[PDB]
């Protein structure tokens, strides 16, 4: 049953969290220096594997917490809630930086993940839904895309405007819930244990474990929703302000199975767009 699957996946996720945090007992102090343009030289003596870039921002000021979406630790992108693992150099990335590219990608992936959650929890129980992948389409494409295979019973059913509005309502419900984007770098073995009941997720985990040197995979949870992440995500769903499941398109190679791509578009609270601009963006995302 879907409820049992979600419960057991969350249980495995929590056991992995407990094991990872127990692997580093006591409080080892790691020095993280602020390499950012503003507030230069501030060095934070943080607890290893417990403290987060959000903790760094909390030490600095509330403005850092509210505006920082990503963290560059030693030059690599990090989630604002991903525990730090060693002394390093930290630089917070906002939406309005000179080159927000990484923040844009993280927001895009987070929006795709929320879309996947809405898709999985929307359909009625009698219909099976299997999320295949979140293609890493550019922002210029005008819509974040999440791919799913629905029950063969609905092979000829296309969502109505009311159905899409219901999906948008569910996504806005998540946004109101304001759930954090919990993250874990966990071995492919545990990832497979979690996703043993999904061939698509299994093979994607295999690809990620092949790409990385070790078998370490990025596993993210918004709430009761485990998913394999292509990259770092944004802090919380409340970052999203405008969110709209624009359309659904069946992919041409239908003979193996119907890969239906859910296309949506969103904008954070920091970059709100007027009503008319949002309408035009919805029109362009519906493609």
């Amino acid at each position: 049953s879907p409820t049992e699957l979600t419960e057991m996946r969350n249980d495995l996720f929590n056991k992995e969290k407990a094991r990872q945090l127990s692997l580093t007992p006591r409080t080892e102090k790691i020095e993280v220096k602020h390499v950012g343009k503003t507030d230069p030289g501030t060095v934070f003596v943080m607890n290893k594997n417990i403290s987060t870039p959000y903790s760094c921002a909390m030490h600095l000021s509330e403005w850092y917490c509210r505006k920082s979406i990503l963290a560059l630790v030693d030059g690599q992108p990090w989630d604002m809630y991903k525990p730090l693992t060693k002394s390093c150099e930290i630089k917070f990335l906002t939406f309005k930086d000179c080159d927000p590219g990484e923040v844009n990608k993280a927001y895009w992936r987070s929006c795709a993940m929320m879309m996947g959650c809405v898709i999985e929890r929307a359909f009625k129980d009698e219909y099976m839904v299997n999320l295949v992948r979140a293609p890493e389409v550019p922002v210029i494409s005008g819509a974040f895309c999440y791919d799913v295979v629905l029950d063969s019973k609905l092979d000829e059913w296309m969502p109505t405007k009311e159905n899409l509005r219901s999906f948008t309502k569910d996504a806005h419900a998540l946004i109101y819930k304001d759930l954090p984007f919990e993250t874990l770098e966990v071995e492919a073995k545990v990832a497979l244990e979690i996703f043993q009941h999904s061939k698509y997720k299994v093979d994607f985990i295999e690809e990620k474990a092949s790409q990385n040197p070790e078998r370490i995979v990025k596993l993210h949870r918004i709430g009761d929703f485990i998913d394999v992440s292509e990259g770092p995500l944004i802090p919380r769903t409340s970052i999203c302000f405008q969110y709209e499941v624009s359309a659904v398109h069946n992919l041409q190679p239908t003979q193996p199975s119907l890969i239906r791509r859910f296309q949506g578009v969103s904008l954070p609270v920091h970059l709100r767009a007027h009503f008319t601009i949002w309408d035009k963006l919805l029109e362009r995302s519906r493609k």
Binding site: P40, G41, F44, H59
Partner: protein
């Protein structure tokens, strides 16, 4: 010089007395017994022991002594200082004004090697802790629970970061 001033002192017997003084002084710190601290430690020690612990509760307890305490070095209107090396085992649990643990564990014992320098004044003087010599090779102390922020240069507008 110590013996020609007192006439009943014993270097061999000192270590047990020094250990008793140390334990009693730390229990006085635990119970906030400043009157007894003024008798068990010097005036160069009492501030160092009490200043940073004011307004917070310390739960200190001596559990055992690994190796027997023994005198190490002694040098001498005239004061006599005796350095005693003690490698014992103790416990710490320091809480905030609000009773929130901020250092150590209430039960886990830790091994501590220290060099306590006691001092005496030579009519009614007595032997009291004067200082604690910390070896330069001393192992780093137990880490703190709370994370810390160290501000960088608070540059004025005319100034630029380097």
């Amino acid at each position: 010089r110590i013996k020609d001033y007192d006439a009943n002192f014993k270097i061999k017997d000192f270590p047990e007395k020094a250990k008793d003084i140390f334990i009693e002084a730390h229990l006085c710190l635990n119970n906030s017994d400043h009157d007894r601290l003024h008798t068990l430690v010097t005036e160069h020690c009492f501030p160092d022991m009490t200043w940073d612990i004011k307004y917070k509760t310390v739960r200190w307890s001596f559990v055992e002594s690994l190796e027997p305490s023994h005198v190490v070095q002694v040098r001498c209107n005239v004061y006599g200082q005796i350095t005693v090396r003690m490698h014992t085992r103790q416990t710490l649990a320091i809480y905030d004004r609000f009773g929130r643990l901020m250092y150590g564990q209430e039960d886990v014992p830790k091994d501590v090697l220290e060099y306590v320098v006691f001092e005496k004044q030579l009519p009614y003087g007595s032997w009291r802790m004067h200082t604690k010599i910390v070896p330069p090779w001393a192992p780093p102390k137990q880490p703190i629970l709370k994370t810390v922020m160290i501000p960088g240069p608070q540059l004025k507008p005319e100034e630029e970061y380097e």
